[PDB]
Amino acid sequence: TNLCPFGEVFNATRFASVYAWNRKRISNCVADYSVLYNSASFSTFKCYGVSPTKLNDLCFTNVYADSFVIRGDEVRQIAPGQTGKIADYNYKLPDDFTGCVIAWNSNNLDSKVGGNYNYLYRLFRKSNLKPFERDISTEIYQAGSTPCNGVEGFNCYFPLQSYGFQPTNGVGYQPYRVVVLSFELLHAPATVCGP
């Protein structure tokens, strides 16, 4: 049996920044979801539309795995009907989302002594994101009526901002790895089935 490569999604050595989340397409494989939903290593495992225990008897056309790193207190924004810095400018889910949001603490990986500043999120944007939209532009944001001309300075900001992840952070601002599994069923044969 050709099992779906979930080990390349969860046990990945590197996760993307939330402003530029990494999408992997899962297709034409056997998807065992009882391996993840029994590990008891996840702090969050919330499924919308599909029951975690019924998940395995369903066939889909494609399954998309969107991965990124955010703060613990920001995990609540990875859900339908939410607003906030992440929900609006970095990663937006649809109100009719069908899928599972899985997250766990990576304080032993994504934190460093002196502070790990390699993770970024979008601080400013002209408008809110649409569902599953991404924006990787670094064009300088104009806060007022005064033109920036691509120059950062007074009333002109670089649109991205870093996180400060260190081992001794409070739980709310420790780093968390998030994987969102989106399940879609189209007209195509539906090649992603469980055991």
Binding site: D73, G84, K85, G114, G115, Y117, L123, F124, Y141, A143, G144, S145, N155, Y157, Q161, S162, G164, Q166, N169, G170, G172, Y173
Partner: protein, 75 residues
């Protein structure tokens, strides 16, 4: 919990300043954008730094800012 106590107020500033980015126009918006940026920048200096006096100075400024932002939200 001194370091954590300060983060609490810095986040409150960033959250309120963020909401105001969809409400305010003109100078009021520009001002809110600054405060938003300030809070998220100070969250990085809070973690990196030392000396209790620097930590308290950040808190006091953050609290003045939060109260200021609420004057924009109510109007």
């Amino acid at each position: 919990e001194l370091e954590e106590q300060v983060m609490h107020v810095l986040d409150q500033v960033s959250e309120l300043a963020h909401e105001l980015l969809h409400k305010l126009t003109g100078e009021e918006l520009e001002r809110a954008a600054y405060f938003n940026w300030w809070a998220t920048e100070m969250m990085l200096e809070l973690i990196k730094s030392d000396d209790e006096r620097e930590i308290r100075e950040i808190e006091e400024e953050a609290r003045r800012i939060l109260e200021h932002l609420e004057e924009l939200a109510r109007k």
